[model samples]
Target: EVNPDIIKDEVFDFVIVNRVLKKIKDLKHYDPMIEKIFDEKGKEMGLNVEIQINPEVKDFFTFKSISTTNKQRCFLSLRGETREILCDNKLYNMLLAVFNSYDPNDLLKHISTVESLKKIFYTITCEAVY
Candidate 1:
């Protein structure tokens, strides 16, 4: 059960908050909510809006947003704003190149290896579970 007062707050946080309020108003019963953003062509583009609160990933210098070059290449950004570009094959290959340059054998204590980080990045982009 939810308090009706909180559902109709005067302060709006984000667009999804408004969307959620709409659902509460229109639908009597609802499933657990999940919201995500995609680009104009229905491609995943924005940062994971909830990465900062997640238990496993947020402690490290985690990246939620990304930027891309005009050549259809993307780079995961840690902080600050950047051009929200879509990912492509070229971008994946470029990331591979960067990962290959790092010596995974060079054990850096308390940090994930370059390969592991790259693997995680791909997983985040491909199948970030909200």
Candidate 2:
């Protein structure tokens, strides 16, 4: 009963990751791929499942609690290009809610400033054009 044979599988990505992260605020996803799931019989009773990960970004980040500093927002710091920086206040609550989710998927959630990442992050693949 446990030996299920190989069936089928397929996966994908989203390029707008970095673009969104740097501007994430009081919001959302890089856009999830809405794949339809249907019943064994070809009927109209299908469901829409969303896929929300930019496959190229393999680095995993985390949430942390830290004391606020004298002159800056303790959002995060750059340990390295692929460093696992821990998120603190400023937005850690929402960030954690999204990151700590079974998926780092936004569940379509918020917003703020935009420019260089004194803010946030994401990914890219092949030749994804904005």
Candidate 3:
């Protein structure tokens, strides 16, 4: 077993993060609490004023909230700066696996291969579970 500090070295490249984000954006639709983002805080998309990734997906992406400054600062699923969403249990769970793993193989359990990752990407996109 490894300690939390060890994960400091275990990080996903921007290349991988980009791939995942692109796949997620394909999901135009959402289910109830899983609101979509429009244009910053100007438009009314869902319950929350903003979403983490819909607002933007490039930098400041992580599953864990390291600070207590109001904003959650998480990946594509969670709401901010305090709310939350579920979108789809299975699909979101798959993402959480990648987002919160300390071991190299831990991600593999969900992503498996780039091919498998895209497989679920396409699958979830087609279904558009909200």
Candidate 4:
């Protein structure tokens, strides 16, 4: 249901615009689309192509995007292999609770904490929740 009416400009190629429109309609995360373009056309564009598309995790319980480091740290915390990444006990405990809530057959089969965090980030960035 995305209208590409306002995208009539010579700066953008027809095929690229079509691909972008398809991505916008299908993907929950715009980062994938942005990353694809950044990787393919970044040299010609000459801009910072590695920009992150998510906000900071101010609240662990209601956090949005899980950074690469945080995602690694989360797995480490789950395994009890390290305590260096978790800066506080409360955050660690919250992460544990999140992990404990994951049940394959009962609930949350397709959705994991990190996956939900990505969805939340996508929702925030795209202004669309689905």
Candidate 3 C-alpha lDDT tens digits along 2-95: 1121112334332222333334432222111222233564453222212122223422222222111132233232222222222344544565
Tens-place lDDT digits, model 1, residues 1-130: 1112233435433432332223333221222122334565656433222112112334332222222221222335333322232455444343333333334375362134444544545454433567
Against the reference, the lDDT scores of all candidates come to: 0.34, 0.29, 0.31, 0.29
The count of residue-pair clashes in candidate 2 stands at 8
Pairing residues by index, what is the TM-score of model 1? 0.24
Worst 10 residues of 1 by lDDT: 46-55
Model 2 residue 121 lDDT score: 49
TM-score of each: 0.24, 0.21, 0.27, 0.21
Give me the candidate number with maximum TM-score.
3
lDDT (Cα, tens digit) per residue for candidate 4, span 10-118 = 3443222332223233232222212211334232321111111221321222321122211222112212222222324444443333434444485563245555534
- Worst 10-residue lDDT window for candidate 4 reads 46-55
Give the Cα error of residue 87 in candidate 2, in Å.
Answer: 25
Off by over 4 Å in 3: 1-86, 102-115, 125-130
| Candidate 2, residue 90: how far the Cα is off, in Å | 23
Worst 10 residues of 3 by lDDT: 1-10
Where model 4 places Cα greater than 4 Å from the true spot, the runs are: 1-86, 109-112, 116-130
